[PDB]
Amino acid sequence: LDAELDQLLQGHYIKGYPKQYTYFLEDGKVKVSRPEGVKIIPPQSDRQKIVLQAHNLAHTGREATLLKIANLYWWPNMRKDVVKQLGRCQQCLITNASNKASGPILRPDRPQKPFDKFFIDYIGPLPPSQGYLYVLVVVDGMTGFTWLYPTKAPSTSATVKSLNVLTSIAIPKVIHSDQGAAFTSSTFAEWAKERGIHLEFSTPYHPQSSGKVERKHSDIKRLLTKLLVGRPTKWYDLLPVVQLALNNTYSPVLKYTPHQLLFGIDSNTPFANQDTLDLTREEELSLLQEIRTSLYHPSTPPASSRSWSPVVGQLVQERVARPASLRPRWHKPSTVLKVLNPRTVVILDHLGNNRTVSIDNLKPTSHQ
Amino acid sequence: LDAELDQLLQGHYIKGYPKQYTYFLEDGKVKVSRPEGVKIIPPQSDRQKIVLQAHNLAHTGREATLLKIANLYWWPNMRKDVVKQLGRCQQCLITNASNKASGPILRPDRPQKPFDKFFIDYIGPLPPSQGYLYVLVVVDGMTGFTWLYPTKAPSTSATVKSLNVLTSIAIPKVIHSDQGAAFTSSTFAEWAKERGIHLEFSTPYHPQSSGKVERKHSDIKRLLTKLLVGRPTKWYDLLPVVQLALNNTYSPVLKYTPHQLLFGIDSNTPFANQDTLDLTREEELSLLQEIRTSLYHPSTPPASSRSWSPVVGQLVQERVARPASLRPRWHKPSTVLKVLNPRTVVILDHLGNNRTVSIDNLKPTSHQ
Amino acid sequence: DRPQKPFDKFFIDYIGPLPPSQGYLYVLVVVDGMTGFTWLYPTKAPSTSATVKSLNVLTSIAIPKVIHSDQGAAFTSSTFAEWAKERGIHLEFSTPYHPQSSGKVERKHSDIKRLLTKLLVGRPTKWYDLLPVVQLALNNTYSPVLKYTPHQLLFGIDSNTPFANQDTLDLTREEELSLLQEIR
Amino acid sequence: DRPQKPFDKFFIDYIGPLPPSQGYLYVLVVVDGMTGFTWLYPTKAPSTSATVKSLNVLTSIAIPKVIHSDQGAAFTSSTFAEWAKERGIHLEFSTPYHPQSSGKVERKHSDIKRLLTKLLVGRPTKWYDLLPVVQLALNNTYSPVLKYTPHQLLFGIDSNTPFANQDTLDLTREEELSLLQEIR
DNA sequence: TGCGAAATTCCATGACA
DNA sequence: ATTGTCATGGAATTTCGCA
DNA sequence: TGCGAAATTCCATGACA
DNA sequence: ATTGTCATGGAATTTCGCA
Ligand SMILES: CCN1C[C@H](C)n2c(c(O)c3c(=O)n(Cc4ccc(F)c(Cl)c4)nc(C(=O)NC)c32)C1=O
Ligand SMILES: CCN1C[C@H](C)n2c(c(O)c3c(=O)n(Cc4ccc(F)c(Cl)c4)nc(C(=O)NC)c32)C1=O
Ligand SMILES: [Mg+2]
Ligand SMILES: [Mg+2]
Ligand SMILES: [Mg+2]
Ligand SMILES: [Mg+2]
Ligand SMILES: [N+]
Ligand SMILES: [N+]
Ligand SMILES: [Zn+2]
Ligand SMILES: [Zn+2]
């Protein structure tokens, strides 16, 4: 503070203050003759209050805060004192946007067998049809085979009814879903435990995690659309036709229909493939097991130039899920406990609870 | 049809049908022994009905339609007949998504003088504050200087009141706005004509065109947010403070505040810049005219690898603006009349009206 | 002659009346010929309509080349014939009073009648909910003639519910006396 | 001594009572010293409150280093002093009964009184709407002493509304007899 | 005429419904 | 008959201070 | 052993609120 | 305590038919 600035006035050298400039007194304030003009050097004990005043004018970031300060003052390492404040402004940290991209997506292994993993999810509300408003969509991970059930609500009770009808055919090892109320209810958990089905949940508000079923929605709605052009939206009667149409549609990258991957042979549907007519069932099922293992699998894409990836103990912030008008889009900072994989982490929130969260719903808190 | 297939059976050569394969008759149908197995060759007169049946199963694109057909049939140039049908399926064309990117954005010249062009737009509804729900935002193109007016509605009448208060300071040559009802009303047109202001309109549903004002919204709301943290959302009293705070904030790329670009000198606000204290007003205004012409101007970014750019007479489709549930996202095909610039076109719609439209709200109709 | 495949032939048939269960009285029984896989649908009547409604659910999953039935009214109706023609399904009837299937189908069909009877005693009214577990049992039941369950023949994999407990399927002395009480 | 700049000094002052216009009776007059640029605000009273309300609109655009006024009550109040101190504005008063400004400001202030009077005759009640056009006129009016209008001094550019028609600003014989009718 | 560190500039990211 | 924009905050690059 | 054209594969784009 | 996906339709590349 006032000590440092005395030594300086009487020609002595202090670290940080370059000796080739003339430091004087005027109007009771230590000044200096810089290329840009003459600036005041406030005492160290003053500098924090100055930065804070500058930053608070509009809650500006680094440079815009610096430019205000530099109008009146100079001292060594100004930006370090600016950055220090930005890291401590709660309002800026919970309001500003991130400018770092997530690391590249994972492409999880295709489940190995039909019925290993089910991906489920609701679409809706749709326009009322026969008193129905939603659709339960179930997608077998390995085959893409899809089951569609109309419901009046995205409820547990309607999910149970529907899954009882489906599980009649086979029971799956795992059912993966998002955290919609229907799937997280204890009534649902009991229903699963009863049947030896393990429930797996997506990180919250991250539908890419349910990507397998999510992507099917687009085809479902797209086909419903084409069929209903010029007519009123009576979709209920179409669900069966849609289901069947899709399950028997070829995926150009795979060269198989989801039905084919499920059964190894077309049923009595138009343009059914006849390539295995001369094989025994057993020969057919052998060639099927072969097809199932040699299906195309996409690899992780290249990282973008400015991606970040989580480290244990790092300060990070969770995205607010449904932010109200004029309210911050980010939660207070939290700490990374475990890095489950490069795109998933467990955080301790300040409350402090443990939460498993997608990297996409995080930013690394700025300025350390 | 039946003619062609006769010549073929008796060993003769027909163009398209490779001579090294054995073409026979069986079950009253012309067949062929292909590497993949034995396929039927339907008569030309049948082929269209076959393609249509295949395509209609799920309204599939090229390859997935081909794969069904290839299960039972072979004939020369199958995909040409497949593509022909896809180009004539009204349902597919108005429903499917584009897979071509727009060409790279234009970066229009910064208006040359304060008051050359005004960009305006509403934000809202916001939470009620003092009975107010919207904000009129006015941004001078050259300076970024911003005026904020609270309103009860995004109406012409409130736009007029507000602009009468502002135009008290100066009249602008042009006012650019989107096509919100408030700005397109004849009452508004009269108000402009009366004052020699020319109204310029954004292509519909393309807020990038109002980018100058749009971008200011984000700063406005962001600052309102930081200020209202932990308090109820009483924003009305803050508009003046926000306006002032922003207009005097430095843009790091420009190194000037919008106020500075407007006036050439800071007013009595904190950290005011004192660099021109020794210049006369006239000397100051001279250095200002200099600053105004040498401001950074960004250039058009590189095109993405799969962009398209409009050509006169091309079939294109306009995006449906507010598509209802299960209804096509695209209008029927229309024709490009004029190419106003590489990112803007005039189209004849089928009704047929003339419409000036953003390239971003278009796709080039597929399959010609 | 090409080897037998799934979806080559569905054997369909009705079972009932039964004691009312959630207002349902019959069961449409569908058995795949080649695999012995079995679908069950509860109906309120053995009518062409309930049959069409039911097979509409099944045929949105898999379509048979041939449906085979006896000459029950529901199956011989001209409505049911139209339905089948619309779908390119060939209909096949066994001669009156002389029902032929296959050994596999006759045996399966017996297991169903026996398995139902076992669980409908002590709770003759709660079968509607049991249908899912009946089918799972039936389809994960080991075949003497082939080495494989119907599940394995349909999907080419082991099931996640192996019914490794082959059951009595016989009535105990407790259940025999209780069933002769219900008839009373 | 450093040269005079915009925002160095705002000369503020009230004009009225006037005939009611949309319930307004006065005009707060703000003139920039250096440029001669003029802001007008309609008020319902020459009170500290209406003054603060008004200058709050102005000071969200530009803040003066010095406000100069006469010793009107509104400006000498201790509320008004607090307001000014909050904003780092130095207050300046002219001695009682001896109002000093500058030549530029006195002349401008005269043009306002004269220009208002000209348009308030024949429509003494519709001035509220005219304020915008009054200011445009005043700020795009050529200065004899400098080569430039206030607009040009404030912004460093030509205006898009040049008032190239210098006006009589004098009352015609028609308006003189009509104004002496309104007083009656 | 070259070092280490501070200052400045670069620029991808995201958000204006 | 028109057209994206620009705060942000680590990284890259340039300039500074000193020799 | 090399040509022109057809077939197949590649893969960016967009959309599942 | 978990994780994107895949139809689409021009362009790029490979294979085909023939010599
Ligand atoms: C309440 C439980 N819950 C949480 C959120 C509401 N959610 C749920 C969904 O099913 C979806 C959904 O399908 N999409 C559409 C979408 C958008 C981008 C994509 F990449 C993909 Cl794959 C899908 N979005 C959301 C969402 O998170 N919006 C912000 C969503 C859900 O059930
Ligand atoms: C009714 C007249 N009308 C038409 C549409 C409704 N619109 C109007 C607006 O002011 C906005 C707006 O601010 N944003 C936010 C936004 C989104 C992406 C961007 F790049 C940018 Cl720059 C801005 N979006 C839309 C819109 O078109 N949503 C689909 C929008 C408007 O007034
Ligand atoms: Mg969901
Ligand atoms: Mg979803
Ligand atoms: Mg708008
Ligand atoms: Mg907008
Ligand atoms: N995995
Ligand atoms: N331009
Ligand atoms: Zn802040
Ligand atoms: Zn189609």
Domains and CATH numbers, chain A: 5-97 (1.10.340.70), 98-105+304-365 (2.30.30.140), 116-249 (3.30.420.10), 250-295 (6.10.20.110)
Distance in angstroms between the alpha carbons of the first and the last residue of chain C: 53
From the list B156, B144, B146, the residue with the least C-alpha distance to B192 is B156
d(CA C164, CA B91): 52
- List the structure tokens of A313: 């103990």
> From the CB of A81, is ligand 1 less than 6 Å away?
no
Amino acid at A201: F
d(CA C98, CA C100): 6
Residue C174: CB atoms within 10 Å: 10
A340 touches strand H (CB under 7 A): yes
Q: What is the CA radius of gyration of chain A?
A: 31
In the DSSP assignment, the letter for residue C165 is S
From the list A127, A225, A125, the residue with the least C-alpha distance to B328 is A225
SS3 sequence of chain A: CHHHHHHHHCCCCCCCCCCCCCEEEECCEEEEEECCEEEECCCHHHHHHHHHHHHHCCCCCHHHHHHHHHCCECCCCHHHHHHHHHHCCHHHHHHCCCCCEECCCCCCCCCCCCCCEEEEEEECCCCCECCECEEEEEEECCCCCEEEEEECCCCHHHHHHHHHHHHCCCCCCEEEECCCHHHHCHHHHHHHHCCCCEEEECCCCCHHHHHHHHHHHHHHHHHHHHHHCCCCCCCHHHHHHHHHHHHCCCECCCCECHHHHHHCCCCCCCCCCCCCCCCCHHHHHHHHHHHHHCCCCCCCCCCCCCEECCCCCCEEEEECCCCCCCCCCEEEEEEEEEEEECCEEEEECCCCCEEEEEHHHEEECCCC
From the list B153, B135, B151, B147, the residue with the least C-alpha distance to B175 is B147
- Output phi, psi for A151, to 5 deg: -140, 165
Q: E strands along B3-57, which residues?
A: 23-26, 29-34, 37-40
Backbone φ/ψ region at B264: left (φ over 0), alpha (ψ -120 to 50), beta = left
- Output phi, psi for B129, to 5 deg: -140, 125
- List the structure tokens of A125: 């509300």
- The angle formed by the CA atoms of residues A211, A212 and A214, to the nearest 5 degrees, is 55
The pocket of ion ligand 5, defined by CB under 5 A, consists of: B 121, 178, 180
In the DSSP assignment, the letter for residue C95 is P
Residue D73: CB atoms within 10 Å: 11
Q: What is the CA radius of gyration of chain B?
A: 31
B271 burial via Cβ count (<10 Å: 0-12, 13-18, 19+):
buried
- Output phi, psi for A355, to 5 deg: -140, 130
Query: What 3-state class would DSSP assign to D168?
Result: coil
d(CA B127, CA B132): 8
Is the CB of residue D147 less than 8 Å from the CB of residue D46?
no
Amino acid at A296: Y
Specify the CATH number for the domain of residue D81.
3.30.420.10
d(CA C138, CA C30): 12
- Mutating which of A31, A55, A148, A222 best tests the B interface, going by the most B Cβ atoms within 10 A? A222
Decide the pairing of beta strands A117-123 and A344-348.
unpaired
Experimental resolution (Å): 2.7
Is the CB of residue D7 less than 8 Å from the CB of residue D64?
yes
- List the structure tokens of A272: 């059914």
From the list D118, D147, D120, D135, the residue with the least C-alpha distance to D32 is D135
d(CA B115, CA B161): 19
Q: Using the structure, give the distance in angstroms from the CA atom of B33 to the C1' atom of H16, rounded to a whole number.
A: 16
- Structure method: X-ray
What is the H or E stretch that residue B346 is in?
Answer: strand B344-348
Is the CB of residue D27 less than 8 Å from the CB of residue D40?
yes
Return the half-sphere exposure (C-beta side, CA atoms, 13 A cut-off) of residue B258: 22
Decide the pairing of beta strands A37-40 and A29-34.
antiparallel
Order of strands across the sheet that contains B134-140: B146-151, B134-140, B117-123, B174-177, B198-201
Identify the domain containing residue C57 by its residue range.
Answer: 1-184
| A26, β-bridge pairs | A29
- Residues 6+ away with beta carbon under 8 Å from A49: none
Is the CB of residue B23 less than 8 Å from the CB of residue B41?
yes
d(CA A281, CA A264): 9
From the list A336, A148, A316, A159, the residue with the least C-alpha distance to A242 is A148
Evaluated on CA atoms A323, A329, A331, A335, the torsion sign reads: positive
Residue A195: CB atoms within 10 Å: 18
Q: Exposure string (b/e) for D84-117, b if CB count within 10 Å is 16 or more?
A: beeeebeeeeeeeeeeebbebbeebbebbeebbe
CB contacts of B164 in chain D (<8 Å) are 129, 132
B255 touches strand F (CB under 7 A): no
- List the structure tokens of C66: 């041939």
Q: How many domains are there within chain D?
A: 1
- List the structure tokens of D67: 């406000």
- Residues 6+ away with beta carbon under 8 Å from A252: B63, B64, B67
Residue C7: CB atoms within 10 Å: 23
Query: What 3-state class would DSSP assign to B175?
Result: strand
Q: Which residue of B has its CA nearest to A68?
A: B271
Is the CB of residue A129 less than 8 Å from the CB of residue A123?
no
DSSP string covering B77-109 = THHHHHHHHHHT-HHHHHHSPP--EEPPPP-PP
- List the structure tokens of D159: 């205006």
d(CA C44, CA C17): 9
Distance in angstroms between the alpha carbons of the first and the last residue of chain A: 26
- List the structure tokens of B30: 């012309």
Decide the pairing of beta strands B174-177 and B198-201.
parallel
- List the structure tokens of B270: 């904190």
Q: What is the CA radius of gyration of chain C?
A: 17
Return the half-sphere exposure (C-beta side, CA atoms, 13 A cut-off) of residue D55: 27
Cα dihedral B174/B178/B183/B184 (nearest 10): 110
Say how far residue D21 (Cα) sits from the centre of its chain: 18
Longest CA span, chain A: 104
- List the structure tokens of A291: 């097809």
Distance in angstroms between the alpha carbons of the first and the last residue of chain B: 26
Is the CB of residue D148 less than 8 Å from the CB of residue D137?
no
- List the structure tokens of A32: 């200096």
- List the structure tokens of D61: 């655009």
B164 burial via Cβ count (<10 Å: 0-12, 13-18, 19+):
middle
**Which chains border A (3 or more CB–CB pairs < 8 Å)?**
B, C
- Residues 6+ away with beta carbon under 8 Å from A183: A120, A156, A159, A177, A199, A201
Instruction: Tell me which residue has tokens 């737009």.
Output: B121
> From the CB of A109, is ligand 7 less than 6 Å away?
yes
Residues shown for chain A: 368
d(CA A174, CA A161): 18
Say how far residue C86 (Cα) sits from the centre of its chain: 24
Residue A246: CB atoms within 10 Å: 23
A352 touches chain B (CB under 8 A): no
From the list A147, A287, A134, A156, the residue with the least C-alpha distance to A216 is A147
DSSP string covering C130-160 = THHHHHHHHHTSPPSSSSS-HHHHHHSS--S
Q: Which residue of C has its CA nearest to A167?
A: C132
Return the half-sphere exposure (C-beta side, CA atoms, 13 A cut-off) of residue B140: 27
Ligand found nearest the CA of B341: 8
Count residue pairs from A and B with Cβ separation < 8 A.
138
d(CA D39, CA B165): 11
Q: Which residue of B has its CA nearest to A35?
A: B275
From the list A110, A174, A105, the residue with the least C-alpha distance to A138 is A174
Q: Exposure string (b/e) for B201-229, b if CB count within 10 Å is 16 or more?
A: bbbbbbeebbbbbbebbebbbbbbbbbbe
- Residues 6+ away with beta carbon under 8 Å from B361: B203, B204, B205, B206, B318, B319
Cα separation values, B44 from B30, B34, B85, Å: 12, 19, 15
| A347, β-bridge pairs | A336, A355
Order of strands across the sheet that contains B37-40: B23-26, B29-34, B37-40
